[PDB]
Design a protein around this ligand. Structure first.
Ligand code: CLA
Ligand code: CLA
Ligand code: CLA
Ligand code: CLA
Ligand code: CLA
Ligand code: CLA
Ligand code: CLA
Ligand code: CLA
Ligand SMILES: CCCCCCCCCCCCCCCC(=O)OC[C@H](COP(=O)(O)OC[C@@H](O)CO)OC(=O)CCCCCCCCCCCCCCC
Ligand SMILES: CC1=C(/C=C/C(C)=C/C=C/C(C)=C/C=C/C=C(C)/C=C/C=C(C)/C=C/C2=C(C)CCCC2(C)C)C(C)(C)CCC1
Ligand code: SF4
Ligand code: SF4
Ligand code: SF4
Lengths: 74, 741, 166, 80, 189, 37, 74
């Protein structure tokens, strides 16, 4: 039971990195902005700083508080 | 005449103006910040005096004055230790019962529950057990009161002020000229005869007149309250005559060269006192007095002002053989014009001295009752080993700074330094082979044992019960040192230490010292040590010899001592600088010292430290080093896993601070990998998105956020790695040896 | 009131077990010293504080688990309905007031010095009068926040914000 | 070999040319800027890829640009 | 005017070539040095040692089989300079010749000649030498140092746009070209 | 003293001072009113 | 105990996502290198200029994210 849970979650982890890797390779090799003008892909690219900054907030918030609470308890 | 004080009056005005202008010392930094990089550059460049000015006189002056500031901070630190010892310690209690009371000189305030750290250490006292050896050192000096500790701490604070004064004076008011600083023969004569010579004479004087009586009385159980005060030994000669009758003859034997009359306080017994487990103080007195004589003599060797004495430049130029070209010519100019060259040599020696101190102070315990304080013994060994490793790596740094900044080809044509640089591919390549050979034939033996053990073939292992590898030379040396008192050191009674052989010295039940025997396990660890030191030399020496050029980069010197790379071409040139060699050598020095202190801790706990019942000695880990250390699994299991029980079971006790420091250090170590494994390209692009959100809410800063530099990332990485590693071992060592022993 | 399967700490046996376990440890330590000595007094102060602390937790409606340790309720509805708002919900408001204050003071000082000749010199050498004035005038920071929000002076317009090739 | 290209934003400061350690770039005459010279890269078979030129360039997004490509013994900086 | 120089005219000076071969030789194997010392009395030991003059930083086997580089210049005085291959050497008054294994080492020494001497030396010429014996002159290629603009030079690899006006890679897919080499004037191989 | 206050106004001095006060205040509160959960 | 670890896992999922999303959204270019698409998915760096540019390619974002993914499945 332990082996099968571990096996499948490690495989899922590697596979989810790949999906994002091949997403980057699409944006470099196959995305053309002229053809995709005004649709959701170009829009998502046009507010990329909002996305990254908001994720940066969530990350900093969880990290601070969660490591905090563990260190308090220790 | 020639050697003379020469100076300049009032060369720099004392004002708080420049204190309010950060970066003043640099042409670039003084324009003010525009990015955050400036802030870091301000701290990184502050003590780099040879980048502020070009004048060697101005540099010498800054160096001399900074030295006084260092002495002032050291004096504050010592005064603190004496004060904490006088006002928050159980030193007077410990002086009555050294064996049972544990030394303690740090109390904690009650707040947020931290008072649990004030443990039960004895002497009607609660506090933190200290492992620095202060109490034993004080006892050896003859200090018995808190008043004496208080006086010392006040005098030291005044003395610290005076040294801060001297620094201001000798920089701002009366600054010596470069000619003064360049009197290296005067400096050597004074530092040998004066600082070390008279220093030893003075301290032998203190020993003979204060430390020897007071210790002699104390070792015969005389209760420190009813001890005479130290002057009483000077004023009343009858007191000191009862203890050492030779004093009744006064100084007449000295002047008539009948020195053998002083053979009751100036001995040559050898070995440890049977009461305290330390060296005999009468030996220590003879030692310091003999040193005095040799140092005063030695400082009479260089020529200053009187037509006698050796000229160093001559002496160096005289020694030149056939293999070596022009030989030692040109070195005198290097050692009297380059501060970085001197700092290199002096750090290499200071580092090597710290390691020798460590090895000599465990085997020949010099203070009363320090050998049966196992926490002290472990702490001092480990401390001095780390200090040594750091200094040696500094020596390599400053040597490379000398090659990049102060090497002149013109003045080094076909001397030793030039010839070294003409065969630097032969030096590095031979070092490379030796390192591979020692790697395979030493760590390969552990991998052998681990594998054959796991395959169920223990008779195929390198072991004392199997294929033996005996360290036969060291055994030979041990035997010779044990027999020495019978022929080759005839006038000595006992050998220098029990380590060489003989009987167990045991104070109360506890073992002070006992013979340390060597076999297969000792052979493998020793060759592991020889391997890790050789690799560290390989990384540091490569950095010094290839600091100016290499086949890859012909003009490295023009790029400098500290530069991140020369770009992604030629296959990629990351970390070619000499600074980057010091950075990688820090990790290998960490690996080397770490293995040595693990060796010590396991060997001492398994084969020396313990308790004696009649004649049977019950060691702390019951002799598991000889068999258990022959595999990696045994190091992990019988050392790392087993001896880590004390630190991980320390919560809720007065040792819980070690538990927290153990986890905290694991954290800081892992945090270091974020800096070591990444690069600033990623971070600068992530900071661009963060700067976006600040910009959108109109709260972006005028000093523009920049990711750290390449060099600084590497520096942060190795700093947090070294801190987290060393503190982890510190927690683990102190919690273990404070509990069990 | 027992909710979520938890017992109140005031009527939990495991809570008492914990208090006993701490007090017993302190007694063991006291055995080594003499009843009048100053270490003894220190251990008594420690024990007093300990018993006081458990008593406080008992009369606060804290809720104990099976471990016998108090547990906090963080859904605001459950907190307010069963009198546990002092565990997380009040601290929320308290943190968000102080964090808004610090932000407001920092933003204010930055917007003030940005109009100076060399604004970056006023970041490494703090204008201490200016900073104290801002620190004390910023106690009513929602005034400035809701004004800036509703007026439109909170956000820079997108045309004035540097951005990459997207 | 690496490929070094020069774009029309050059201002003819000669700094890239000075920086280059394998003599790949030179200044040729031009009329697109006040200095009346542009950089050029005739000898790109000798370029090692160090990117020293791009570090020297003072224009906002560089006018000289090194695109790393196929390795040769010359570009790999080998003395063997 | 200026004509392409010849290494042959430089290599006529047999002393300067001797020195160059002396300095671009590898240090001897220990065996060989032992044998040399074995054939002399003790008084003559430093003379044997003085007969070596090379280092370990000099040419290896590639120089013989691929290409080496030569720098020539003329010095006004006898002075010590620093080799780019580690160590020091003496330039003689008159013609100096030195062999190196990379062009970067040559130009490094050239850079030192133009900065670190009080009468600056500007007259160095660098040549590439093939095993067959062809000698290609390299630097300064047209007589004028490349930092100085010289008539007759043409634009090489010029792109007549800014860097933001390059195309997207996704627009030239399966066509055999990149955005960086579209419409490049003076495109070299 | 003529530029000593400007030195005290620099960022690391002001930081040390501010943290020291803020820390001291939290310590003194945790002396008077301990164990707030 | 379940509350703390679930917040740790959240920290790991968000932080892995942030590294990979930055990778994919800064793939074609950033301010530190506006022409990143011309160098491709994987390249070492753009040299020590402009303050230094180690690990600036999208491949490096993937490489960084794999440590975070192993930590999170861990
Ligand atoms: C269906 C799934 C799938 C498919 C069809 C592809 C296809 C491709 N990938 Mg993608 N990718 C995937 C999943 C997939 N990938 C996943 C799961 C990840 C996350 C790990 C990635 C991350 C990824 C990256 C980061 C990149 C690609 C690239 C590519 C392309 C070239 C790969 C190459 O050249 O391999 C040849 C590679 C090898 C032969 C190396 C093997 C390394 C081994 C497996 C390490 C294993 C360690 C050791 C051997 C273990 C042994 C046990 C030990 C005890 C001895 C190709 C189009 C690359 C590309 O070019 O796009 C530009 C690229 O850079 N992929
Ligand atoms: C234990 C190891 C460790 C830790 C603690 C971190 C922490 C972090 N990583 Mg790093 N990382 C690590 C290993 C680690 N990493 C490794 C091994 C790699 C692979 C190379 C990375 C690669 C990486 C990338 C690529 C990214 C991160 C990011 C982060 C940040 C995520 C924010 C957050 O979660 O909480 C908040 C912060 C913490 C929990 C740490 C702060 C520590 C304490 C809480 C601060 C208080 C200190 C205290 C006052 C004492 C001061 C010191 C004194 C001497 C003065 C955080 C700073 C990401 C990020 O920055 O997103 C914004 C990000 O993009 N990490
Ligand atoms: C006997 C004469 C004498 C003595 C005792 C010393 C002692 C010292 N000098 Mg040396 N020095 C001397 C002559 C002397 N010097 C001469 C003649 C020159 C010029 C050629 C120098 C040039 C020199 C320089 C350039 C430097 C030193 C430094 C030092 C200190 C080294 C650190 C140390 O070990 O502290 C151990 C501390 C003590 C022993 C306490 C000393 C207390 C007082 C000052 C002793 C006075 C004796 C008293 C009258 C009885 C040490 C204090 C270094 C230093 O640290 O400067 C600040 C340093 O940078 N010296
Ligand atoms: C007597 C000993 C000594 C002296 C006088 C010097 C003097 C100097 N060193 Mg050398 N060096 C030494 C020993 C010494 N070093 C040792 C032991 C090492 C190996 C670690 C080095 C390795 C070294 C390198 C690699 C470099 C120098 C450089 C320098 C120069 C500038 C230093 C500077 O500005 O930093 C200012 C000081 C700091 C930024 C402080 C750094 C704080 C460290 C990283 C952390 C300390 C941790 C602390 C102990 C505990 C934790 C603190 C807590 C808050 C958590 C200066 C000439 C630099 C140079 O290039 O000059 C040419 C340089 O690059 N040194
Ligand atoms: C465990 C981690 C690890 C290991 C195994 C190595 C191994 C090595 N390091 Mg690396 N290093 C490491 C971590 C490690 N390093 C880290 C963390 C850093 C800091 C960044 C470095 C930085 C570093 C530097 C800067 C240098 C090294 C060098 C070396 C080489 C030392 C020479 C040697 O001993 O080869 C012998 C090989 C070993 C001891 C590896 C194990 C081999 C096993 C036991 C044998 C394998 C089985 C084999 C098939 C059996 C054949 C015989 C049998 C049939 C009888 C060696 C390959 C140095 C070097 O290359 O100098 C020559 C060097 O200069 N390392
Ligand atoms: C963030 C996610 C979140 C989640 C999952 C919950 C979940 C819940 N809320 Mg809470 N709540 C939340 C945020 C959340 N709340 C917020 C932000 C507020 C405004 C401050 C509230 C205010 C609130 C009230 C007023 C009530 C709940 C109640 C509940 C319970 C709903 C029972 C029902 O549907 O009938 C359930 C445990 C109900 C409950 O049962 O509490 C006793 C209820 O009456 N919630
Ligand atoms: C005026 C100061 C100020 C203000 C109002 C903000 C506001 C913000 N920051 Mg920023 N930040 C600041 C300073 C400030 N920050 C500083 C000094 C740093 C360097 C450590 C950062 C580093 C930083 C990062 C890495 C991130 C933010 C983010 C954010 C946004 C979300 C909230 C947050 O993450 O807090 C977190 C705040 C910190 C981690 C920094 C602590 C700020 C201190 C405590 C207060 C200011 C100190 C200052 C010296 C006060 C002097 C005032 C005095 C002279 C009057 C929010 C817009 C996040 C974001 O982008 O959201 C979308 C984000 O990822 N900030
Ligand atoms: C990061 C998350 C985190 C959180 C949420 C907490 C929360 C808490 N900690 Mg913990 N702690 C943490 C990290 C954290 N800590 C870390 C990293 C450490 C190790 C250094 C500690 C070590 C620690 C100890 C040793 C103690 C606490 C205590 C506390 C309690 C504080 C009581 C108090 O002083 O309030 C009162 C303070 C105020 C009301 C602030 C006043 C500000 C102004 C004047 C008010 C303005 C409002 C208008 C509180 C529950 C204490 C406690 O008793 O917990 C039960 C306690 O003894 N913490
Ligand atoms: C070691 C023997 C030793 O040092 O002999 C000494 C020998 C040179 O001695 P010389 O007689 O030339 O003179 C040495 C001094 O008088 C001048 O430096 O050393 C070397 O030739 C270097 C050998 C490295 C060999 C590496 C192994
Ligand atoms: C709860 C629940 C439910 C519902 C559900 C839901 C709502 C779900 C959702 C889900 C989801 C919602 C999911 C998601 C996920 C996601 C992801 C996982 C993503 C990822 C992505 C990626 C990675 C991508 C990439 C890319 C790029 C980057 C670029 C371009 C291209 C592409 C797109 C490829 C029900 C009612 C039934 C029942 C009850 C419970
Ligand atoms: S990358 Fe280096 S070798 Fe190539 S052109 Fe630029 S400076 Fe010259
Ligand atoms: S490419 Fe840049 S560095 Fe070279 S001349 Fe033009 S502007 Fe100057
Ligand atoms: S910029 Fe970074 S990755 Fe590139 S060569 Fe320099 S050190 Fe290496």
């Amino acid at each position: 039971m332990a082996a099968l849970y571990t096996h499948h979650q490690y495989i899922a982890g590697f596979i989810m990195t790949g999906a994002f890797a091949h997403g980057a390779i699409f944006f470099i090799r196959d995305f053309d902005e002229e053809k995709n003008k005004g649709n959701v892909l170009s829009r998502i690219l046009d507010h990329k700083e909002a996305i990254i900054s908001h994720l940066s907030w969530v990350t900093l918030f969880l990290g601070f508080h969660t490591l905090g609470l563990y260190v308090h308890n220790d | 005449k020639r050697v003379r004080v020469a100076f300049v009056s009032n060369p720099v005005e004392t004002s708080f103006e420049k204190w309010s202008r950060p970066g003043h010392f640099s042409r670039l930094l003084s324009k003010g910040p525009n990015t955050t990089t400036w802030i870091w550059n301000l701290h990184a460049d502050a003590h780099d005096f040879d980048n502020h000015t070009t004048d060697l006189e101005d540099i010498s002056r800054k160096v001399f004055s900074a030295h006084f500031g260092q002495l002032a901070i050291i004096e504050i630190w010592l005064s603190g230790m004496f004060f904490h010892g006088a006002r928050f310690s159980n030193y007077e209690a410990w002086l009555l019962d050294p064996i049972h009371v544990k030394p303690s000189a740090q109390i904690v305030w009650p707040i947020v529950g931290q008072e649990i750290l004030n443990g039960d250490v004895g002497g009607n006292f609660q506090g933190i057990q200290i492992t620095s050896g202060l109490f034993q050192l004080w006892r050896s000096c003859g200090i018995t009161s808190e008043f004496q500790l208080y006086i010392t701490a006040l005098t030291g604070l005044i003395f610290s002020a005076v040294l801060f004064f001297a620094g201001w004076f000798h920089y701002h008011k009366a600054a010596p000229k470069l000619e003064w600083f360049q009197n290296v023969e005067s400096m050597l004569n004074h530092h040998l005869s004066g600082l070390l010579g008279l220093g030893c004479l003075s301290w032998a004087g203190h020993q003979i007149h204060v430390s020897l009586p007071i210790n002699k009385l104390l070792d015969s159980g005389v209760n420190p309250a009813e001890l005479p005060l130290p002057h009483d030994f000077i004023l009343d000669k009858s007191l000191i005559s009862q203890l050492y009758p030779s004093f009744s003859k006064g100084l007449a034997p000295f002047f008539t060269f009948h020195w053998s009359e002083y053979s009751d306080f100036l001995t040559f017994r050898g070995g440890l006192n049977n009461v305290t487990g330390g060296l005999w103080l009468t030996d220590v007195a003879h030692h310091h007095l003999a040193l005095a004589v040799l140092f005063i003599l030695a400082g009479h060797m260089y020529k200053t002002n009187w037509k006698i004495g050796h000229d160093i430049k001559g002496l160096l130029e005289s020694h030149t053989g056939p293999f070596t070209g022009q030989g030692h010519k040109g070195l005198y100019e290097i050692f009297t014009n380059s501060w970085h060259a001197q700092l290199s040599l002096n750090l290499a020696m200071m580092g090597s001295l710290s390691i020798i101190v460590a090895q000599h102070m465990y085997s020949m315990p010099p203070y009363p009752y320090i050998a049966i304080d196992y926490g002290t013994e472990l702490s001092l060994f480990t401390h001095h080993y780390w200090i040594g490793g750091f200094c040696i790596v500094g020596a390599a740094a400053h040597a490379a700074i000398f090659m990049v900044r102060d090497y002149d080809p013109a003045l080094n044509f076909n001397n030793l330094l030039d010839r070294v640089l003409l065969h630097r591919d032969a030096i590095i390549s031979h070092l490379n082979w030796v390192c591979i050979f020692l790697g395979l034939h030493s760590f390969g033996l552990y991998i052998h044992n681990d594998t054959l053990s796991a395959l169920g073939r223990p008779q195929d292992m390198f072991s004392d019960s199997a294929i033996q590898l005996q360290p036969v030379f060291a055994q030979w040396i041990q035997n010779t040192h044990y027999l020495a008192p019978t022929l080759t050191a005839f006038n000595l009674v006992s050998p220098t230490t029990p380590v060489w052989g003989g009987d167990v010295v045991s104070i109360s039940g506890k073992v002070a010292m006992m013979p340390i025997k060597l076999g297969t396990a000792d052979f493998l660890v020793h060759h592991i040590h020889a391997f890790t030191i050789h690799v560290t030399v390989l990384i540091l020496l490569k950095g010094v010899l290839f600091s100016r050029s290499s086949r890859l980069i012909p003009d490295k010197a023009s790029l400098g001592f500290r530069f991140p790379c020369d770009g992604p071409g030629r296959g990629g040139t990351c970390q070619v600088s000499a600074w980057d060699h010091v950075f990688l050598g820090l990790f290998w020095m960490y690996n080397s010292i770490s293995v040595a202190i693990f060796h010590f801790s396991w060997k001492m706990q398994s084969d020396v430290w313990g308790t004696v019942l009649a004649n049977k000695v019950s060691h702390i880990t019951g002799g598991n080093f000889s068999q258990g250390s022959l595999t990696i699994n045994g190091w992990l299991r019988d050392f790392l896993w087993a001896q880590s029980s004390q630190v991980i079971q320390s919560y809720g006790s007065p040792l819980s601070a070690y538990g927290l420091m153990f986890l905290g250090a694991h954290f800081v170590w892992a945090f270091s990998l974020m800096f070591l494994f990444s690069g600033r390209g990623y971070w600068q692009e992530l900071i661009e998105s963060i700067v976006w959100a600040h910009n959108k809410l109109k709260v972006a800063p005028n000093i523009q956020p920049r990711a750290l530099s390449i060099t600084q990332g590497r520096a942060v990485g190795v700093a947090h790695y070294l801190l987290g590693g060393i503190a982890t071992t510190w927690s683990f060592f102190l919690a273990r040896i404070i509990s069990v022993g | 009131e027992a909710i979520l399967g938890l017992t109140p700490c005031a009527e939990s046996a495991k809570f008492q077990k914990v208090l006993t376990k701490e007090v017993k440890a302190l007694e063991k330590r006291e055995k080594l010293y003499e009843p009048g000595s100053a270490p003894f007094q220190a251990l008594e102060a420690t024990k007093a504080k300990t018993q006081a602390r458990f008593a406080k937790y008992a009369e606060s409606g804290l809720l104990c688990g099976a471990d016998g340790l108090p547990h906090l309720i963080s859904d605001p509805g459950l907190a307010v309905k069963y009198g546990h708002a002092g565990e997380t919900l009040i601290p929320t408001i308290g943190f968000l007031y102080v964090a808004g204050y610090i932000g407001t003071a920092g933003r204010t000082y930055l917007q003030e010095i940005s109009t100076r000749q060399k604004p970056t010199q006023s970041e490494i050498i703090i204008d201490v009068p200016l900073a104290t004035s801002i620190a004390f005038k910023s106690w009513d920071w929602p005034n400035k926040a809701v004004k800036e929000l509703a007026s439109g002076t909170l956000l820079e317009d997108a045309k004035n914000v540097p951005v990459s090739r997207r | 070999s690496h490929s070094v290209k020069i774009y029309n934003t050059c201002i003819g400061c000669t700094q890239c040319v000075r920086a280059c350690p394998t003599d790949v770039l030179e200044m040729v005459p031009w009329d697109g800027c006040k200095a009346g010279q542009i950089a050029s890269s005739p000898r790109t078979e000798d370029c090692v890829g160090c990117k020293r030129c791009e570090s020297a360039c003072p224009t906002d997004f560089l006018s000289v640009r090194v695109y790393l490509g196929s390795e040769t013994s010359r570009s790999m900086g080998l003395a063997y | 005017a200026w004509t392409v120089p010849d290494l042959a005219d430089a290599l006529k000076n047999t002393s300067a070539v001797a020195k160059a071969k002396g300095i671009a030789t590898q240090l001897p194997t220990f065996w060989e040095l032992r044998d040399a010392l074995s054939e002399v009395p003790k008084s003559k030991f430093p003379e044997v040692f003085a007969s070596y003059k090379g280092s370990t930083g000099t040419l290896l086997s590639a120089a013989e089989k691929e290409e080496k580089y030569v720098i020539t210049w003329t010095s006004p005085k006898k002075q010590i300079f620093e080799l780019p291959t580690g160590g020091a050497a003496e330039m003689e008054e008159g013609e100096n010749i030195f062999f190196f294994a990379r062009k970067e080492q040559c130009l490094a020494l050239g850079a030192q000649l133009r900065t670190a001497f009080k009468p600056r030396i500007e007259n160095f010429q660098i040549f590439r030498v093939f095993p067959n014996g062809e000698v290609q002159y390299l630097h300064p290629k047209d007589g004028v140092f490349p930092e100085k603009v010289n008539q007759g030079r043409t634009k090489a690899n010029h792109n007549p746009r800014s860097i933001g006006e390059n195309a997207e890679p996704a627009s030239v897919k399966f066509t055999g070209t990149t955005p960086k080499d579209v419409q490049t004037e003076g495109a070299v191989a | 003293m003529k530029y000593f206050t400007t030195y005290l106004s620099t960022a690391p001095v002001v930081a040390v001072l501010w943290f020291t006060l803020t820390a001291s205040l939290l310590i003194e509160i945790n002396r008077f009113f301990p164990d707030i959960l | 105990g379940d509350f703390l670890v679930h917040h740790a896992i959240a920290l790991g999922l968000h932080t892995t996502t942030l590294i990979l999303v930055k990778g994919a959204l800064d793939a074609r270019g950033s301010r530190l290198m506006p022409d990143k698409k011309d160098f491709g998915y994987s390249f070492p760096c753009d040299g020590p200029g402009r303050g230094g540019t180690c690990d600036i390619s999208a491949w490096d974002a993937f490489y960084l994210a794999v440590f975070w993914m192993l930590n999170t499945i861990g």
